[PDB]
């Protein structure tokens, strides 16, 4: 169903994450981690303290798709196990995946983001915030990921 998903997204904040390659998203999906440039790191840390859920929605540049979405489970921290990103960096955020399935941009064409001049939600720099209603509807468009159990995510809220 979609009910636990809606509960997790209630009053969440949403951020568009743009990755230059698939390898980094694959690493994030396998290890449950993300890292971003300091300007976005500071914004995500502020959001994590201020909201019940902070949701990252991932898109690989040139792919024409989103690759899934995840919820922050920590602020950024240094000194952990190093991650061999493919680089073109601040701390590491732990994340719990909510959906690991892809969504083509063709299916999000009816959603515009008020915080980016009402451009289609697919358009945005890495770290662009997505307004609550746009972000909720975007997450609800993804195919259901029946491999994930949101019971444990709910307990971290």
UniProtKB/Swiss-Prot annotation:
Subcellular location: Nucleus; Nucleus speckle
Result, substituting residue 37 to T: Reduced binding to N6-methyladenosine (m6A)-containing RNAs
Recorded consequence of changing residue 34 to A: Abolishes binding to N6-methyladenosine (m6A)-containing RNAs. Abolishes binding to m6A-containing mRNAs
Effect of substituting residue 19 to A: Does not affect ability to influence alternative splice site selection
Sequence positions that bind RNA: 18-20, 34-35, 85, 126
Residue numbers bearing the Phosphoserine modification: 81
A GO MF term: mRNA binding
Gene Ontology CC entries for this record: nuclear speck; nucleoplasm; nucleus; plasma membrane
Documented effect of changing residue 125 to A: Reduced binding affinity for N6-methyladenosine (m6A)-containing RNAs by 100-fold
Major subcellular site: nucleus
Record text on subunit structure and interactions: Interacts with SRSF1. Interacts with SRSF2. Interacts with SRSF3. Interacts with SRSF7. Interacts with SRSF10. Interacts with CPSF6. Interacts with KHDRBS1/SAM68. Interacts with TRA2B. Interacts with KHDRBS3. Interacts with EMD. Interacts with RBMX. Interacts with ZCCHC8.
Entry text on domains: The YTH domain mediates RNA-binding.
Official protein name in the record: YTH domain-containing protein 1
């Amino acid at each position: 169903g979609t009910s636990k998903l809606k509960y997790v997204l209630q009053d969440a904040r949403f951020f568009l994450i743009k990755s230059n390659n698939h390898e980094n998203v694959s690493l994030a999906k396998a290890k449950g981690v993300w890292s971003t440039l300091p300007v976005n790191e500071k914004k995500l840390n502020l959001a994590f303290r201020s909201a019940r859920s902070v949701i990252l929605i991932f898109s690989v540049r040139e792919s024409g798709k989103f690759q899934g979405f995840a919820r922050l489970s920590s602020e950024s921290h240094h000194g952990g196990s190093p991650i061999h990103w493919v680089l073109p960096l601040g701390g590491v955020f732990k994340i719990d995946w909510i959906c690991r399935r892809e969504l083509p941009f063709t299916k999000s064409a009816h959603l515009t983001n008020p915080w980016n001049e009402h451009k289609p939600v697919k358009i945005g720099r890495d770290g662009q915030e997505i307004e609550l209603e746009c972000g909720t509807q975007l997450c609800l468009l993804f195919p259901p990921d029946e491999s994930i159990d949101l019971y444990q995510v709910i307990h971290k809220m």
